[PDB]
Amino acid sequence: SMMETLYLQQNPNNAEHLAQSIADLERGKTITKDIDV
Amino acid sequence: ARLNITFSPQAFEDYKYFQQNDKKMVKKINELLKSIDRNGALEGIGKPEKLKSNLTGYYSRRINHEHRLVYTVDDNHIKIASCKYHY
């Protein structure tokens, strides 16, 4: 259950990207688009 | 379906990179988005996983061997934190 979390965290550059990007989502620094799927 | 998708700035830059360089990657990301919308955060393609640690509140699906779609869903609205691994 932890392997995927650890994969995302194992490289500090990816961990920093995720931390900043989660903060951006939670603080309202975002870009919204319509995507046809 | 037409989905209204919110991206983090970094995820949006990476999605644009794929639009410009790897249309098959875009197609796969979009199939994952279709599945999240149709079946919810935890159900469907890409081996969905509830993330732990300080990623709690978010989920991962596998785009390919290295890239993960990291996202959450609030009131049926999909928010993308990441769609590409930052090495």
- List, by residue number, the catalytic residues of B: 49, 86
- Locate the chain A residue with the closest alpha carbon to B62: A4
What gap in Å lies between CA B66 and CA B75, rounded to an integer? 29
Distance (Å) of CA B52 to CA A6, A16, B32, B55: 9, 16, 20, 5
Tell whether the torsion through CA atoms of B19, A7, B9 and B75 is positive or negative. positive
Residue pair B72/B41 in contact (Cβ under 8 Å)? The answer is: yes
What gap in Å lies between CA A27 and CA B6, rounded to an integer? 13
Residues of A in contact with B36 (CB under 8 A): none
The bridge status of strand B49-50 relative to strand B59-62 is antiparallel
Q: Which amino acid is at B63?
A: I
What gap in Å lies between CA B38 and CA B36, rounded to an integer? 6
In the structure encoding, which two tokens stand for residue B46, read together?
């890409």
- For residue A8, count other CB atoms closer than 10 A to its CB: 24
Cβ contact, residue pair B86, A31, below 8 Å: no
User: What's the angle, vertex CA B65, arms to CA B63 and CA B69, rounded to 5?
Assistant: 25
Q: Which DSSP category does A32 fall into?
A: E
- Which sequence spans correspond to the domains of chain B? 1-87
In the structure encoding, which two tokens stand for residue A36, read together?
């046809």
Question: Could you write out the DSSP letters of every residue in B46-86?
Answer: S--EE--GGGTT-EEEESSSS-EEEEEEETTEEEEEESS--
Chain A touched by B7 (CB under 8 Å): yes
- Locate the chain B residue with the closest alpha carbon to A1: B49
